[PDB]
Amino acid sequence: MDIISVALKRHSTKAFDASKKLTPEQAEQIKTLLQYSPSSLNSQPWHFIVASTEEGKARVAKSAAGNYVFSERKMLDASHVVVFCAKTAMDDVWLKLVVDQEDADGRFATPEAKAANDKGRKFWADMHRKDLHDDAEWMAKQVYLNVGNFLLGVAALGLDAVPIEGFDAAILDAEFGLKEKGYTSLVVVPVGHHSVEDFNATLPKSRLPQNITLTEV
Amino acid sequence: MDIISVALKRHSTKAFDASKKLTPEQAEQIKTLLQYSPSSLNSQPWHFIVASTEEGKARVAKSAAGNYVFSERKMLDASHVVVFCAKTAMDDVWLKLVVDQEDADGRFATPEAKAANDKGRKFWADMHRKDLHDDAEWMAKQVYLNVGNFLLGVAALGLDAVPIEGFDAAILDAEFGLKEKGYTSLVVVPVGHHSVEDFNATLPKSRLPQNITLTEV
Numbered sequence: 001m002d003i004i005s006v007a008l009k010r011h012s013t014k015a016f017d018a019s020k021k022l023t024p025e026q027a028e029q030i031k032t033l034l035q036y037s038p039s040s041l042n043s044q045p046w047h048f049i050v051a052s053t054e055e056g057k058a059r060v061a062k063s064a065a066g067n068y069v070f071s072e073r074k075m076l077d078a079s080h081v082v083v084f085c086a087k088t089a090m091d092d093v094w095l096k097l098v099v100d101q102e103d104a105d106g107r108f109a110t111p112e113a114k115a116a117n118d119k120g121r122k123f124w125a126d127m128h129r130k131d132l133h134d135d136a137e138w139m140a141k142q143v144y145l146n147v148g149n150f151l152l153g154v155a156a157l158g159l160d161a162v163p164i165e166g167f168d169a170a171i172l173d174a175e176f177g178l179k180e181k182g183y184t185s186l187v188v189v190p191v192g193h194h195s196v197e198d199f200n201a202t203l204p205k206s207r208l209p210q211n212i213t214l215t216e217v
Numbered sequence: 218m219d220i221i222s223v224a225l226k227r228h229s230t231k232a233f234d235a236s237k238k239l240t241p242e243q244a245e246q247i248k249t250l251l252q253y254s255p256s257s258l259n260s261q262p263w264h265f266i267v268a269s270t271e272e273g274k275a276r277v278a279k280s281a282a283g284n285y286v287f288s289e290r291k292m293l294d295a296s297h298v299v300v301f302c303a304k305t306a307m308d309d310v311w312l313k314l315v316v317d318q319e320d321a322d323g324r325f326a327t328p329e330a331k332a333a334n335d336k337g338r339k340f341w342a343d344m345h346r347k348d349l350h351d352d353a354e355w356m357a358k359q360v361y362l363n364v365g366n367f368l369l370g371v372a373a374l375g376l377d378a379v380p381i382e383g384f385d386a387a388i389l390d391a392e393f394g395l396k397e398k399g400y401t402s403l404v405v406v407p408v409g410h411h412s413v414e415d416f417n418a419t420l421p422k423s424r425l426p427q428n429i430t431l432t433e434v
C-alpha cells in the first residue's frame with residue numbers, strides 16, 4: 001500500500017493462527033530483510049535463528065519460561081520465528097569477513113582502496129573496543145536497528161508479527177549454544193497471521209503527541 | 218516494486234542535492250514514521266529534533282567537529298536532518314503520560330484495565346531501572362529500533378538518507394540543552410535526495426552470505 005498506511009495498520013500480534021503459514025516466497029523474503037539491513041560501518045554484528053518447524057520452535061519457546069511464559073504461545077503458534085542475535089565482541093576476523101566480502105562485491109577499485117576502508121573501519125571499531133569499551137552495547141544497537149527494519153518489512157509483505165523482549169535470553173543462548181559461537185539473544189520476533197484471540201488486532205493504536213516527542217528547528 | 222526491492226535499492230547517501238527539498242507532505246510523513254514506531258511496553262523513550270532551516274541544520278552540524286568533520290557536509294546539504302534522542306532515565310511520570318494517552322485513544326474498556334496495564338508496564342520497567350540497572354541502554358535500543366524502521370520507511374517514500382554515528386553527542390546535547398531535559402543524542406539522520414558526488418549511489422550493496430549469519434531450525 002502506502003508505507004504510512006503500513007506503519008499505521010501494523011500491530012503486535014498477541015495470538016497467531018497455527019493454520020496460516022508463510023508462502024514459500026515470503027519465507028525467503030524475510031531472510032532477505034534480515035540480511036540486507038543497514039549497519040554502522042557495515043559491521044553486520046548479528047546472527048539469526050529462523051525456526052519454521054514445530055521441533056525448532058519448541059526449542060525457542062523453551063525461553064518463554066518463568067516470568068515470560070505468556071510469550072510461549074506466540075512463539076509456538078506463529079509460522080516462522082526469528083531470533084535476533086548480536087555479537088558479544090567485535091573481533092578482527094569479523095571485520096575482515098566484511099571487507100573481504102565488500103571486495104568480492106566490487107566495492108573497491110584497487111587493493112589500496114580496500115586497505116583504507118579496512119583501516120578506517122578499525123579506527124571506529126577500536127574507538128568502541130579499546131577506548132569506550134562499549135562494543136557489546138554498540139553491536140546490540142545495530143541488531144535493534146535491524147528489528148525495526150524487519151518489523152516494518154514483514155508488515156509491508158502482508159504478515160503479522162510481534163517483537164518479544166519477554167523471554168529468557170540465558171535459556172535461549174544455551175539451547176542454541178550461542179555464547180560459544182559469539183552471540184547473544186536480544187529480540188525474538190514470531191511472524192505469521194493473527195487469530196481471533198489477537199485482542200490487539202481489535203484495539204486502536206496509541207502514540208504520544210508530536211508536541212511532546214518532536215522539536216522543529 | 219515491493220518492500221524487498223526498496224530494501225535492496227536503498228543506500229547511505231554521502232552527498233545531498235541542496236536544491237532538492239522534501240515536499241510538505243513528505244515532511245509530515247517522516248514525522249509520522251518517527252511517532253508511530255513500535256517500542257517495548259510502548260514506552261516511546263524518545264525525542265526527535267527535525268532541523269529543516271539553514272540555521273537549524275547548522276546548529277546540528279556543530280556536532281560534526283574533530284573526528285566527525287566529514288559528516289558536516291551531509292548534515293548541511295540534506296533537506297531535513299533528524300536527530301534521534303533517547304531518554305536518560307525512565308521516570309514514573311513518563312510511564313503515566315503513556316498510560317493516560319492509551320486511555321484517551323480508547324485502548325481500555327474500564328479503569329481497572331488501565332491500572333493493570335499500568336501495573337504491567339512498571340513490573341517490567343522496574344526490572345530495568347531497579348533490578349538490572351540498564352534502562353538507559355534499554356531505552357537507547359528502542360531508539361535504534363526506530364531508526365531502522367525510519368530508514369526503510371523514507372526509502373519507500375522515495376527519499377535518500379544516511380544514518381550517522383560519526384558525530385559529537387556532547388556538543389549536540391549541549392547545543393539543544395538536552396542533558397538537563399532528560400535526553401541524549403544517538404543517531405543523526407539527514408533525509409533528502411542525493412547528488413552526483415554521492416559515490417555510494419554508484420556502488421553495489423554488500424552483505425554477508427546467509428550461510429554465515431543465518432541458521433534455519
Ligand SMILES: Cc1cc2nc3c(=O)[nH]c(=O)nc-3n(C[C@H](O)[C@H](O)[C@H](O)COP(=O)(O)O)c2cc1C
Pocket residue numbers: 010011012071162163164165166167187205254255256257258259359362
Ligand atoms: C523491543 C520490543 C520488545 C517487545 N516485547 C514484547 C513482548 O515481550 N511482549 C509483547 O506482547 N509485546 C512486545 N513488544 C510490542 C510492544 O508492546 C508494542 O509494539 C507497543 O505496545 C506498540 O504497539 P504496536 O505493536 O501495535 O505498534 C515489544 C516491542 C519492542 C519494540
Ligand SMILES: Cc1cc2nc3c(=O)[nH]c(=O)nc-3n(C[C@H](O)[C@H](O)[C@H](O)COP(=O)(O)O)c2cc1C
Pocket residue numbers: 037038039040041042142145227228229288379380381382383384404422
Ligand atoms: C547506526 C549507524 C550509524 C552510521 N553512521 C555513519 C556515519 O557516521 N557516517 C557514514 O558515512 N555512514 C554511517 N552509517 C552508514 C553505514 O556506512 C551503512 O549503513 C553501511 O555502509 C551499509 O551500507 P548501506 O547503507 O548502503 O546499506 C551508519 C549506519 C548505521 C546503521
